[PDB]
Structures are given as structure tokens and as C-alpha cells.
Write a protein that binds this ligand. Structure first.
Ligand code: HEM
Ligand code: HEM
Ligand SMILES: CNCc1ccccc1OCc1ccc2ccc(N)nc2c1
Ligand SMILES: CNCc1ccccc1OCc1ccc2ccc(N)nc2c1
Ligand SMILES: C[C@H](O)[C@H](O)[C@H]1CNc2nc(N)[nH]c(=O)c2N1
Ligand SMILES: C[C@H](O)[C@H](O)[C@H]1CNc2nc(N)[nH]c(=O)c2N1
Ligand SMILES: [Cl-]
Ligand SMILES: [Cl-]
Lengths: 362, 362
């Protein structure tokens, strides 16, 4: 009965995947073998090629992603073999090292064993493999509020943060069978961080801002042909606005705009001065400059939008329908200056794809 | 059979309107009289109170409008009495003068006689009562491209523009019965314009930019209780971004960003410099400064969003459902710095409301 759903999702997926791979003739016999595998086992196992291509399609179908031009160059690491928490740990460490690539970031995904009966083999608690802790107590606020609750959950497990504004959270995950997750401190040698400086306002370094090099999302499920890879962390490189216009700017995040206005020498008293907008622009210029100066990959929202226009053009030529979420595709800074703002996008969900799933805590 | 639609729209409208006006008891007898009026005549006529309140509700229900906090102070001018093109003209002139109010702008609407059988009594061709002409020929581009086609249609009627970048289009409209519209040159004494200067970059005036004081939208239909007021031009004051981030910035409008970058002393060579964003911010600061210096009403996107937050709060207290179009409500500059960006809005259409209708030409 769920053997049903799996089979249909498998037919749809294998047909399209083998088609795109020029292997249309092998569809029939591969489906045959799958049809039997589901019967006996209650599931089927992807070939390395299907799994690599599915992860690529899934990125291609991510409506909210402006970076999709490069879907076909995704570096897929197949780690369906892992059985131990040491192996998971070492896999997660490797992912960080290989994706980082000394600053020249490789979009990469590491794929762990999929859910069995909706039962997770590996359950990752981090939202990104590399994220900063957040604390709030007695009015006091330190670090990244977005991480307050995961931070409290790590501190239930005998971890303790130093309470700087940029404590690296440990990796934390649970193995099937275990009642509590384990946690491992990140080796600082693996984590590139970028101090934020401004191209020509030297006082900007007084803010003592920094951010980490690589956003590695670890809380989404990759679904491919009815197989549910709940643990499959992936990374791109940052678009500068994500850091400069949100992580560092939002009132519910680091909330730095007033501090930025002060070091850039402008008043923060009157809305009509547009001081927040000016602060946002200088902060965002600073972030791109710092990543570039440090030789860590990053893209500005204008170039990103240009690439996405190429993605739109490439999709039409291949005869693929384009889907997209206008509300996430527009950048949070000068959106009307990108072509994205001035057109609309069909927000339909096509599979394979990445999906939200609930965290264990919270 | 359309006597049907009219009656239902009339019941819905009178019930809600009289309710909001504390006149619930008068609903039954007023409906009675309407029920008979439709029977005999094929339509019904609004009282002055219903028409004023309907126009106010219609603004309140405009999902794309961030300025709705002030819906209840709309100044409604009832001009259902007009029968001649001289009267229409003089009504349109008055609207400009009274809405402008020497710079202290009054949100106003002038309401002309409604459609009879879907037949317009008065058919206004302008998109705004005050707009700039646009020309394109032999690669050459002058004025406001948004106005290219209306401009060509006026020049079919024996008008001729001087071909500056800021020619005022004439008022142009057609009376039921007439085959061609008539046109009337706007008296310059009625039209306030604002030269764009920057608070502290004196070279900014070399761009020789200006814009008109009052946006008076003349192409939407006001619908109230099944009555279709195709001619009912209305105005607010500008939000600075409409001028600085769109009318003057869009490549398909005045396309000034490169020129702005030059006078503000920054390079326009590299996306990573975020020169468009910086140009956008200085251009927008300039617009707000110029309107304020000239004593012409204007609002910045931050204050506007704050007012709209108050509108949201006021709607909840009155037990009214809020509707809104997130994609138009977010400003095109620093949208993530307003609360609007971070919540969602039900885009349902509630009546009374303003609607798009086709232009005669094009
Ligand atoms: C290579 C550089 C990449 C860039 C610059 C990029 C850029 C972005 C941005 C800016 C967002 C929106 C975040 C926001 O507005 O808050 C996003 C969303 C997303 N991206 Fe990408 N991306 C890249 C690579 C990838 C990769 C490799 C994948 C997966 C294989 C991916 C999948 C997604 C998904 C699933 C979302 C939506 C997440 C959600 O719903 O919360 N992207 N991307
Ligand atoms: C008092 C100051 C006002 C301000 C600042 C204001 C602001 C705005 C803005 C910024 C937009 C969106 C334009 C865009 O994003 O391109 C808008 C849309 C709109 N406003 Fe207002 N508004 C005001 C008054 C009014 C009035 C008096 C009415 C009618 C009685 C009105 C009805 C609308 C409508 C119908 C739209 C949508 C038009 C469309 O769909 O094209 N507003 N308003
Ligand atoms: C469940 N959402 C996952 C998530 C957790 C923590 C931060 C952002 C997230 O999603 C937004 C998102 C997702 C994938 C991205 C890939 C690359 C990139 N530069 N930004 C990206 C941004
Ligand atoms: C059919 N759309 C009408 C229209 C024609 C020409 C310019 C803008 C328009 O609609 C957007 C619009 C509508 C009403 C507004 C009222 C006040 C204001 N400051 N901006 C406003 C902007
Ligand atoms: C239809 C499509 O979403 C279109 O490009 C919209 C985008 N959002 C907008 N938002 C505003 N404020 N004004 C516009 O003219 C548009 N155009
Ligand atoms: C659900 C609601 O639209 C929400 O505020 C969205 C708005 N658009 C967004 N767009 C981006 N890029 N990132 C976000 O986190 C959000 N949040
Ligand atoms: Cl992030
Ligand atoms: Cl306008």
C-alpha cells in the first residue's frame, strides 16, 4: 500500500532520469528489477548514477534557489555504506574539507543511508554543519538567535559554549537505536572564517564582524524516486546578501545596522535619511570585498540573477518547464534591479527535490 | 439576469456599509427601494454617504496598497452630475488643484457617472492625470517609455509634444456619443513639479532630474455594490521609492542609475561594487530630500511600512480580515528591513475595490 506509492514514484523517476541520461532503452529492465525488489524487500536501492543524477535534478527543481544554473556540476558523495557514528562524523568532516577546497568552494552533497520505514538510520540535529551558537538569558543576548534552541539542546548533552558571539556549535546527530545524539567539536583547522572589513572605511573592522565560509544545509530531506534521504547535507557558496542583508542585519539575527551606521559616519535618527538602506549597502559591499580578499568563493546578487537568467534560458532550450518561488528568488537588496522582480514564476513542486522535515528537539 | 448580479452585489454592499455606519436598521427599507429601482430602471443610484463610504472601503480593500492606514480620511468628490466635456475638464482641473493643496497633498477621488449598460458615460484615456510623454524613433528615446503609446495616440489627435524628457501630456478623454476623445493642455500653474537635488552632493543637480508632485491614477474602475465607476480618478502622495527606485531607475523607464553613479563619484564597472544599490540609495535619498525641501508631501518606505503595520493592527481590532499582495506591498528597496517582508498576506479580493480595465487605444 506504500509499496504502491514507492513504485509509482520510482517509475516516474527512472523514466525521466534514464531519458535525460540517454539510457531510455534500459528503463524497462531496470524497472522490472525494481518492481521485484520492492515486492520482496519493501524498497529498492539506487545505482550510483541514479543517486547522483537524482540529487542534481533535486537542486534543479528547487524553486527557491537562484543558484540553479550550476545544478549539473554538483559533486555527489555516496555514503550509503556508513553504519557507525565515527563513520558519520568522519563523513561530515570530509564533506566540510572537500566542499571548502581551500576557499574555492565546490558545491557538494554527501548522501547518507535513507529512511527505512520512515525510520531514520542517521538523524542530523544541526541546521547547518557550520553554524554559530546563540544564547539568551536575563535580557542578555549573545551569538545568533536563530541558534538559541539547538544551543540549549547541545548544552543538555554536556557541551558548553564559550559565549562569544561566534561560538562554533558542535556536530550533533543520533544513530538509529541510540536514545540520545552524540556531539563532536569541529576542528578549527577545517572551518574557514572571514573577518568582515570594508574596501575603504577602515573603522569598519571595529565592528569585529566575521562569518564562516561555507553554508552547508543539514536539515532537509532529499527525495528521489520515493526514497527518502533525510540525512543528505549539501552546500553551495554564499550569495553576499544572505550574510550582509539578513544574517548580520535582521533584528532577530545579529542586528548590526545601527552599529554599521555609526562606523560609516552617518546618523541613524531619521527614516527619511534612508540610513538603514545605506548601512545595508556598505555592509553588503564589505562582505563581498572580504570574501574576495580572503579568496573564498561568493557571488553578488546581480551576477547571481544573471546566472539565473541563463538558467531560465537553458531550461527553455531543453524543453523543461521552469518552476520558481518569486518571493524567495528576489534578493533582499535592490530586487527591482534584477530581471527576476519583473517577471513571475510558476511555484509548482516537481520531484526529485529537497524538503523541510521536523527537528527532533523543538 | 444581470439585474440579478447587481442586486446581490447591492445587498452585500448595503448591509456591510450601513453596518459600519451604525445604520443597520435602515438597511431593510433602503434595500426595498433599491430592489424596486433595479426592477424598473435596470440600475440604482447611491446616496452621497454610500458613495463616499464605498470609495473608502475600496481603498481599504486594495491588496497592493501600503498606504491604506488612511483609508477613512479619503476626500470624495461626487461628480455624477457632469454631462459635458467642459464640465469633465473643469472637474479634472479642480481635482488636480484641490488634491495638490499647495503641496500639502489631500488624498482625493473625483467620481464621474458610472457605466450604464457597460457603456461608459465618460472614458478617460490618461493613466495618470499628470504624466510625462514618451517618444521612440530611429533608436532615439526621449521622455517616459511607459507613455510611448498614449503619446502616439495624442499625436494622432493633433497634439504635438515639444520632445523634452518631461513634456506634460494633455488630459484626454471621450464622452459617450463622440467617436474621438478631446484633449486639453494642462495649465502649468496647476502642476507642481519637484527638481531633484541631493542633500550634500551638489553635482546631483547636473542630472537635471525632476518629477511631478501628485500621482493621480485615472485608469482604474471603482466598483461599489455592483455599480461600475469606470471614471473615478484618485490620488495619494508618493512613496519615495516609486519615483527613485522605479520611475527614474528602471531600464524601461528613465534608466538613470549609471548617470547617478557618475555624479556621486563612484565607478559603474563591477557588480561586486554594488554600484547599482548605492546609486539607488543616493537617488532615493535625493528624491525624499527634494520633496521635503519643496514642501510637497511624500513618505519614505520605512515610515510607510510602519503606518501599514498600524493598519494591520487596526484591522484586527475591528475584527476585519486583512488582505494584501506581498509581492506589491514589499518596497523595492531594502524590503527585508520592513516587517512586511517577514510575514505573509492573504491575497483574496474583497469588494468594494479598484480594478484594471482596458484602455481604448492599445
Ligand atoms: C552554488 C551556489 C549557490 C547559491 C549562491 C545559492 C543561493 C541560494 C539562495 C540565495 C537561496 C535562498 C536563501 C534565502 O533567500 O534566504 C537558496 C535557496 C535554496 N537553495 Fe541554493 N544556492 C546555491 C547552491 C545550492 C545547492 C548546491 C543546493 C542543493 C544541492 C541548493 C538548494 C537550495 C534550496 C533547497 C533552497 C531552499 C531552501 C529552503 O526552502 O529553505 N542550492 N539558494
Ligand atoms: C496617501 C498615500 C498613498 C500611498 C503612499 C500609497 C502607496 C501605494 C504604493 C506604493 C502602491 C504600489 C505601487 C507599486 O508598487 O508600484 C500602491 C498601490 C495602490 N494604491 Fe495606494 N497609496 C496611497 C493612497 C492611495 C489611495 C488614495 C488609493 C485609492 C483611493 C490607493 C489605491 C491603491 C491601489 C488600487 C493600488 C494598486 C494599483 C494597481 O493594482 O496597479 N492608494 N499604493
Ligand atoms: C530548512 N531550511 C534550511 C536552511 C537552514 C539554515 C539556513 C538556510 C536554510 O535554507 C536557505 C538556504 C538553503 C540552501 C542554500 C544553498 C546555498 C546558499 N548560498 N544558500 C542557501 C540557503
Ligand atoms: C492600472 N494601474 C494604475 C497605475 C497607473 C500609473 C501608475 C501606477 C498605477 O498603479 C500603481 C499605483 C496605484 C495607486 C497609487 C496611489 C498612491 C501612490 N503613491 N502610488 C500609487 C501607485
Ligand atoms: C507580475 C510580476 O510579479 C510583476 O513583475 C510585478 C512584481 N512586483 C511588483 N511590485 C511593485 N511594487 N510594482 C510593480 O510594478 C511590480 N511588478
Ligand atoms: C513566509 C514569508 O513569505 C517569509 O517572510 C519569507 C519571505 N521571503 C523570504 N525570502 C528569502 N529570500 N528568505 C526568507 O527567509 C524569506 N522569508
Ligand atoms: Cl546562512
Ligand atoms: Cl507613478
Amino acid at each position: 500500500e506504500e509499496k504502491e506509492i514507492l513504485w509509482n514514484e520510482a517509475k516516474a523517476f527512472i523514466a525521466a532520469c534514464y531519458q535525460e541520461l540517454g539510457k531510455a532503452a534500459e528503463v524497462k529492465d531496470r524497472l522490472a528489477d525494481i518492481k521485484s525488489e520492492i515486492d520482496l524487500t519493501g524498497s529498492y536501492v539506487h545505482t550510483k548514477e541514479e543517486l547522483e543524477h537524482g540529487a542534481k535534478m533535486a537542486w534543479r527543481n528547487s524553486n527557491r534557489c537562484i543558484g540553479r544554473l550550476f545544478w549539473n556540476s554538483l559533486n555527489v558523495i555516496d555514503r550509503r555504506d556508513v553504519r557507525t557514528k565515527e563513520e558519520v562524523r568522519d563523513a561530515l568532516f570530509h564533506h566540510i574539507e572537500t566542499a571548502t577546497n581551500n576557499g574555492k568552494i565546490r558545491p557538494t552533497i554527501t548522501i547518507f543511508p535513507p529512511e527505512e520505514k520512515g525510520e531514520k538510520q542517521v538523524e542530523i540535529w544541526n541546521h547547518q554543519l557550520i553554524r554559530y551558537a546563540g544564547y539568551e538569558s536575563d535580557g542578555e543576548r549573545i551569538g545568533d538567535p536563530a541558534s538559541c534552541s539547538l544551543t540549549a539542546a547541545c548544552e543538555e548533552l554536556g557541551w558548553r559554549g564559550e559565549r562569544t558571539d561566534f561560538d562554533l556549535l558542535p556536530l550533533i546527530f543520533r544513530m538509529k537505536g541510540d536514545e540520545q545524539p552524540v556531539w563532536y567539536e569541529l576542528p578549527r583547522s577545517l572551518v574557514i572564517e572571514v573577518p568582515i572589513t570594508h574596501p575603504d572605511i577602515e573603522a569598519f573592522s571595529d565592528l569585529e564582524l566575521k562569518w564562516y565560509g561555507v553554508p552547508i544545509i543539514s536539515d532537509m530531506k532529499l527525495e528521489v524516486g520515493g526514497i527518502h534521504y533525510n540525512a543528505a547535507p549539501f552546500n553551495g557558496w554564499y550569495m553576499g546578501t544572505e550574510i550582509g542583508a539578513r544574517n548580520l542585519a535582521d533584528e532577530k539575527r545579529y542586528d548590526k545596522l545601527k552599529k554599521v551606521a555609526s562606523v560609516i559616519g552617518i546618523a541613524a535618527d531619521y527614516n527619511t535619511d534612508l540610513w538603514k538602506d545605506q548601512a545595508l549597502v556598505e555592509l553588503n559591499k564589505a562582505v563581498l570585498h572580504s570574501y574576495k580578499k580572503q579568496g573564498v568563493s561568493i557571488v553578488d546578487h546581480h551576477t547571481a540573477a544573471s546566472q539565473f537568467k541563463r538558467f531560465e534560458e537553458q531550461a527553455e532550450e531543453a524543453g523543461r518547464k521552469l518552476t520558481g518561488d518569486w518571493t524567495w528568488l528576489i534578493p533582499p537588496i535592490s530586487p527591482a534591479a534584477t530581471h527576476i522582480f519583473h517577471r513571475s514564476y510558476d511555484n509548482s513542486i516537481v520531484k526529485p527535490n529537497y524538503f523541510y522535515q521536523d527537528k527532533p528537539y523543538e
